[model samples]
Target: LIDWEQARQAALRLSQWEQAPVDNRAFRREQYARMVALSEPLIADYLGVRLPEPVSRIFVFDRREWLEANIVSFSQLFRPIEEMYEKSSKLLGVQIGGLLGYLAQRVLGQYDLSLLSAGGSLYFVEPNIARVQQQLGLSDEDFRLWITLHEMTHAFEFEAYPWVRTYFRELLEQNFALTPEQRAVFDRIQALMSLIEGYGNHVMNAVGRRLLPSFNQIEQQIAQRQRQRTMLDQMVFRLTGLDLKLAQYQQGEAFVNAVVAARGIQFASRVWERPENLPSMDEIRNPGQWIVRMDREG
Candidate 1:
């Protein structure tokens, strides 16, 4: 087992590298230390679990230019939602950057988990200074940390729960061949990406309600947008082969509530635990039934 303390120290050293002037030896050393420290444990933990060799090795970058160059390559699987891109980037950049500076620590939080080379190693890039510095403001870092934590949960889920990837693949396969009507449906499905974004906001608020109330505002904005009743609802309904209506949202809400009730307030924290215990996609659609089923089985 890797020493957790040593791993932490590695993170600290890497954080220190953010201050290294261009062409500085100390910066290079810091980068090396950070890479070694961060990489070893992550790889060890992943490998120890026998997680299919990551489908690639992980890499870490600290520059915005590096992230930009690599993002398209990494995100090849999913269509980019350009409308939300700028807003999401701005929010994340400001919040994470401020927090790093406030803590007197170098920002080492930004990383891409999807990048894998032919050798099956994963690559992660670190924070971009220009992006972070641009978004500095009071309370921004706190929000950024919240967003980062939420996204990190997604990465962990994708790795820990193989089923998630399977489900997404199935969804894609089912929707792959598009008719003209299906094309129209796909457009709506794309629009429902907003709801998916809202769902994320919901998770953030539900998970960290006490730590951040700004999430509530985020949820409200999403709700308002969704209420306008665009083609998104009709599109998602057809694509998922499920009924899309206000009742479905209510059902989803009730289901989520039951899961929370079963799992307790700290269920989100349990994400680090075994995959079976964490909430499944089904629970998102109907928590009450899932809770009852689990209880009956127990």
Candidate 2:
């Protein structure tokens, strides 16, 4: 029913100890916090929900700290899986932690919904962000703000619609959270995730255009890079099974645009109203299917 957390620490520590971000960590934390502060309200307004409580405090982290902090959350998430694999528990942390360390090299930013500290925790991986910005030739301000908007929208979705988290918990409890082997439930959950990510992408890009004069260039640069994933990137994608998430952005955004065009943005938000009303994966690919189905059900 349980497992030790020690091996994971040693595993990630070995990999991340030498890694760090360049320049002014304390100062960067302030700027990153500002990005969240700015993104939160606008996200709330766009979604027609109040900015939830404890939405303060986001920080930039060096690779070491980022790995350390996520290991805690990783430990929390592993409990369910650990209980399922009681006989072979000791190896879980090593395998999983080693995998996380491998991926830590590339992660840019993440919003941790499970951590209830500081209005909830959001981490921007400083070195990766710096590297990406350098490659794209973006200033710290523009790229950080754009990235923050995506994470902030994720946070807002969790808080604004409580069922989103609860439903995901049920999926985890059902052993269907990460491994969507069952096609039916996978489609349903995938549809929800697709909409969540797509909506965020749509909002952030739209807003980035308005606020940042260089948004067009920076957005194109970032988007182009995302299209070309490296071998390490492909490895992590397979390891974490998050290649599906990439499709969530692409297919989902197109679905969102279709729904908004056909009916309105408000119509798309109804999928959040209840569990039964959610879209199927097919509906995620074709918004009209869910729309008409839900309309008839109503």
Candidate 3:
């Protein structure tokens, strides 16, 4: 439905404006790949499942490259609705481009499973990561390690349980086309994504503390950074549902933590054992309810 060419042009301009210089792509490419390799055993140990195989490839991308890659992914996402809308597609494309540009500037890294691949790819956006490390006054190595752990956790989550990938894809298909079912589908998407993000955050902290001396400091700084957003930034976040997205991490982590605290990590992980075990939106907020239900079912 989107006028994707215009989206690309707009995204290119906005994403590149005053962006960090990615002259060290070669250095970052090698360094990030090594970090991913180094993290594999650590994450596997904590999660209790070895990845079936190594990640196929890692890409260290500049802002322009990140924007281009996401444009393709977003295009795939919008494909189902293409026949349903036409006139507004151009405007929608520009707005989407603007949003992508914003994301390209901010997102440090991603473990992307939403692509057409048997094994998903990992992306480290060099410019954005560089910019954040500089802005936060963090040690480059420490900051990179933190991000690598977070993304690698995601890789483990999807790969260890093959069913997650299929379930996630099913949700993606159901979510794209508009219908009265949109509300329920979006809620499921929100709940599932919250768990995904929250699990990543939980694992990052659990595993990162042993490996990163600056773990607590980075956590404090990141919290401060989120709190210090400008009014315009807050407005844009609200408009884009990014605020809701942020909440997913918080709520999801809370649910995971509560479950883990009460029963232990093994029981907490049972959510991943089956789709039915996944919590509903209400269940995420009230962990005791989910625990009671799961225990009863067992």
- Using lDDT as the measure, the top candidate is 3
Q: How would you order the candidates by TM-score, starting with the best?
A: 3, 2, 1
For candidate 2, the 10 contiguous residues with the lowest summed lDDT are: 111-120
| Number of the candidate with higher lDDT, 1 or 2 | 2
What's the lDDT of the predicted structure labeled candidate 3?
0.73
Better of 1 and 3 by lDDT: 3
* Better candidate by lDDT, 2 or 3: 3
C-alpha lDDT of all candidate models, in order: 0.38, 0.66, 0.73
Off by over 4 Å in 2: 1-6, 87-94, 112-121, 176-181, 224-248
Can you give the TM-score per candidate against the true fold? Answer: 0.38, 0.82, 0.85
User: Model 3, stretches more than 4 Å misplaced?
Assistant: 17-19, 86-89, 112-120, 176-181, 224-248
Pairs of colliding residues, candidate 3: none
- RMSDs, each prediction? 14.4, 4.2, 4.0
TM-score of 1: 0.38
Relative to the unseen true structure, what is the Cα RMSD of model 2?
4.2
Candidate 3 is scored at a TM of: 0.85
Largest TM-score belongs to which candidate?
3
Query: Please, what are the lDDT tens digits per residue for candidate 1 over residues 23-105?
Result: 43355345434443443344335323333333332344444333334333323322323323344444433433332222223
Residues 106-160, candidate 2, lDDT per residue (tens digit)? 6676742222111365788878788889888897787878778777877776667
Clashes of each: 19, 1, 0
